Design an enzyme around this catalytic site. Sequence first.
Site, PDB file in Angstrom:
ATOM      1  N   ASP A  59     -15.282  -4.531   9.612  1.00  0.00           N
ATOM      2  CA  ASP A  59     -16.546  -4.107   9.073  1.00  0.00           C
ATOM      3  C   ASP A  59     -17.213  -5.194   8.233  1.00  0.00           C
ATOM      4  OD1 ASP A  59     -15.541  -4.249   6.577  1.00  0.00           O
ATOM      5  OD2 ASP A  59     -15.330  -2.086   6.293  1.00  0.00           O
TER       6      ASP A  59
ATOM      7  N   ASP B 163      -6.435   8.286  -0.301  1.00  0.00           N
ATOM      8  CA  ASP B 163      -5.929   7.271   0.634  1.00  0.00           C
ATOM      9  C   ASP B 163      -4.690   7.831   1.327  1.00  0.00           C
ATOM     10  OD1 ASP B 163      -7.887   5.462  -0.323  1.00  0.00           O
ATOM     11  OD2 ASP B 163      -6.355   4.257  -1.447  1.00  0.00           O
TER      12      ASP B 163
ATOM     13  N   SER C 297     -11.852  10.853  -3.635  1.00  0.00           N
ATOM     14  CA  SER C 297     -11.356  10.543  -2.293  1.00  0.00           C
ATOM     15  C   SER C 297      -9.856  10.372  -2.372  1.00  0.00           C
ATOM     16  CB  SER C 297     -12.005   9.313  -1.662  1.00  0.00           C
ATOM     17  OG  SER C 297     -11.737   8.129  -2.434  1.00  0.00           O
TER      18      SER C 297
ATOM     19  N   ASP D 290     -12.724   8.551  -7.549  1.00  0.00           N
ATOM     20  CA  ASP D 290     -13.961   9.269  -7.154  1.00  0.00           C
ATOM     21  C   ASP D 290     -13.606  10.538  -6.407  1.00  0.00           C
ATOM     22  OD1 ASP D 290     -12.976   8.380  -4.818  1.00  0.00           O
ATOM     23  OD2 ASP D 290     -14.772   7.270  -4.214  1.00  0.00           O
TER      24      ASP D 290
ATOM     25  N   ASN E 103      -8.861   5.270   3.372  1.00  0.00           N
ATOM     26  CA  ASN E 103      -9.608   6.090   2.413  1.00  0.00           C
ATOM     27  C   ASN E 103     -10.542   7.082   3.107  1.00  0.00           C
ATOM     28  OD1 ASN E 103     -11.246   6.917   0.185  1.00  0.00           O
ATOM     29  ND2 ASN E 103     -11.442   4.834  -0.613  1.00  0.00           N
TER      30      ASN E 103
ATOM     31  N   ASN F  89      -7.927   8.782  -5.404  1.00  0.00           N
ATOM     32  CA  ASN F  89      -8.828   7.785  -6.002  1.00  0.00           C
ATOM     33  C   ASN F  89      -9.685   8.456  -7.094  1.00  0.00           C
ATOM     34  OD1 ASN F  89      -9.314   6.756  -2.631  1.00  0.00           O
ATOM     35  ND2 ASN F  89      -7.941   5.769  -4.177  1.00  0.00           N
TER      36      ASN F  89
ATOM     37  N   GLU G 244       0.814  -1.191   0.000  1.00  0.00           N
ATOM     38  CA  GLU G 244       0.000   0.000   0.000  1.00  0.00           C
ATOM     39  C   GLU G 244       0.868   1.270   0.000  1.00  0.00           C
ATOM     40  OE1 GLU G 244      -3.019   0.402  -0.511  1.00  0.00           O
ATOM     41  OE2 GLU G 244      -3.937  -1.605  -0.046  1.00  0.00           O
TER      42      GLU G 244
END
EC number: 3.2.1.17
Length: 129
Positions: free
Chosen positions: A101, A52, A50, A48, A59, A46, A35
């Site tokens: 989650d 990271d 967003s 969209d 994110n 990202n 990562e």
Amino acid sequence: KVFGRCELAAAMKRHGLDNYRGYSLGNWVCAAKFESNFNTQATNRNTDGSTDYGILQINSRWWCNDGRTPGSRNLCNIPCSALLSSDITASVNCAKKIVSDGNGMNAWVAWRNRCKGTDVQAWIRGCRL
Ligand SMILES: [Cl-]
Ligand SMILES: [Cl-]
Ligand code: NA
């Protein structure tokens, strides 16, 4: 901060990630490698809009506030900048929420595509831990 491999392993283990939700330490070190290359200051935008953040590329769409991801959530209740610190506490505490989650470490695409089903214990071999 750019962590060494064993350095990061030991920090993560101290913060309780070793075996957290069933994921052995080497999974977490492998995920960090791919990562962020162990760099706490890593950021990546990202599609969209967003971003990271940090060693585990958490994110802003869901997990932290950056003020520039319209409509997003802040489920770890932190500024995204907290995830860039040399102290990995905020990144580890937030990763524990993410991995809980429902989808475990599949939340991290680099873990799925580069660590899942490999010899992840190689990532901690040699470390005096
Ligand atoms: Cl391991
Ligand atoms: Cl799982
Ligand atoms: Na957010």
